[PDB]
């Protein structure tokens, strides 16, 4: 049905000749190249590169028409079919290309970027339709879910819709730690903006994330057990213990990422947020105790707890009492740890104090320096 596409361009060509922008000879050249592309798309063996080439060709024709309008007509916009004809046509090629090749994420991305650029011409509702259709074809690609989540939180700032995106995406892909990470990142961004707006309100006059964290920890554990086991359960007790250990280390690294995430957000009470994570690991999980089965992971937990109170204290505002509390915590854990663990926990704590505080303090002017050096010597 290549010819039917050819008449649809006739009204545009007649408008171009009528406005004088393009001569009949030149317009004939345009029609000849469009004819070749239309044959290429409708023939067998057609590929996405053919659609990209035709879209690129039409874009150049749009540029040439625009400049000839100012050059010859001397008008920004001539009220005729020629103005929106190319832009409408280019969208049609995208629709045909995406439908023909739903696999290619590359063409979908160009489709969305092309229309988001022309926000005035293309309503945001149509953008939702494309994201809707794309999500249905690829529900398991977390990148798409975040893309519409990001677009509707930045361009439109509709937090309600963006939450539904994350809720729907996590429903389809609860085993992807990345999607949970971004959803928490979105959750903290909303609180930080909300509190900043509250601060602005006064001038001119969060636990919810932790719940997302907790469920992320459980669901990721389940799927990691579902994987590494296949269809059947593992009969041997020792292997089942190894699978439990794999989840703990896998989850512990994931939880460690959320600890790193908390540091970015200054407004929130990071110590309170981190303490909840520490409390989560203090609970026995999968019948394995961190102190007994994974001392190396336990040591990192102890180190964070010991340095929790002094983690965010700047060198200028260092409180001796808070430092004493940190040391008091450090001594308490030694009495319950083995000799090898104590040496490892020891060396780490000395480096932490030396790098963060001792190296950044002037030895001659700060009286706290001698106390830090004495504490470092005694530890």
């Amino acid at each position: 049905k290549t010819r039917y596409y050819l008449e649809q361009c006739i009204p545009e060509m007649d408008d171009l000749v009528e406005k004088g922008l393009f001569t009949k000879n030149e317009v004939s050249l345009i029609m000849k190249k469009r004819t070749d592309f239309e044959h290429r798309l409708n023939s067998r063996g057609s590929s996405i590169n053919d659609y990209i080439k035709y879209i690129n060709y039409e874009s150049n024709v749009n540029k040439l028409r625009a400049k000839r309008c100012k050059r010859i007509l001397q008008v920004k916009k001539t009220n005729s079919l020629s103005d929106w004809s190319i832009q409408q046509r280019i969208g049609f090629i995208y629709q045909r290309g995406t439908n023909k090749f739903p696999q290619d994420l590359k063409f979908w991305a160009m489709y969305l970027n092309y229309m988001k650029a022309r926000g005035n011409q293309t309503s945001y509702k149509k953008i939702h339709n494309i994201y809707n259709q794309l999500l249905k074809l690829h529900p398991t690609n977390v990148d798409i879910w975040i893309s519409c989540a990001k677009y509707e939180y930045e361009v439109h700032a509709n937090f309600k819709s963006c939450r539904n995106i994350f809720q729907n995406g996590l429903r389809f892909n609860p085993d992807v730690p990345k999607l949970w990470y971004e959803y928490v990142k979105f959750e903290l961004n909303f609180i930080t903006k909300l509190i900043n707006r509250r601060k602005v309100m006064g001038l001119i006059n969060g636990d919810i994330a932790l719940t997302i964290f907790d469920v992320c920890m459980k669901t990721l554990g389940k799927h990691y057990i579902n994987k590494h086991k296949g269809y059947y359960a593992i009969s041997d007790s020792k292997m089942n213990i190894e699978l439990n250990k794999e989840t703990l280390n896998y989850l512990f690294s994931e939880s460690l990422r959320y600890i790193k995430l908390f540091d970015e957000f200054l407004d929130l009470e990071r110590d309170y947020l981190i303490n909840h994570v520490l409390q989560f690991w203090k609970n026995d999980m999968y019948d394995l105790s961190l102190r007994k089965d994974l001392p190396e992971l336990y040591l990192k937990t102890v180190m964070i707890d010991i340095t929790l109170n002094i983690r965010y204290m700047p060198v200028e505002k260092l409180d001796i009492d808070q430092l004493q509390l940190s040391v008091k915590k450090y001594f308490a854990y030694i009495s319950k740890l083995d000799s090898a663990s104590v040496k490892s926990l020891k060396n780490e704590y000395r480096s932490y104090l030396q790098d963060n505080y001792l190296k950044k303090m002037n030895a001659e002017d700060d009286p706290r320096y001698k106390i830090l050096d004495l504490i470092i010597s005694k530890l």
Binding site: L105, D143, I144, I146, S147, Y153, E182, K185
Partner: peptide, 18 residues
């Protein structure tokens, strides 16, 4: 929120013969 999607844009049954 980081998404690569935008960055992505730019014979067995034969007997022997005697």
């Amino acid at each position: 929120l980081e998404t690569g999607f935008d960055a992505l844009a730019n014979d067995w049954f034969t007997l022997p013969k005697p």
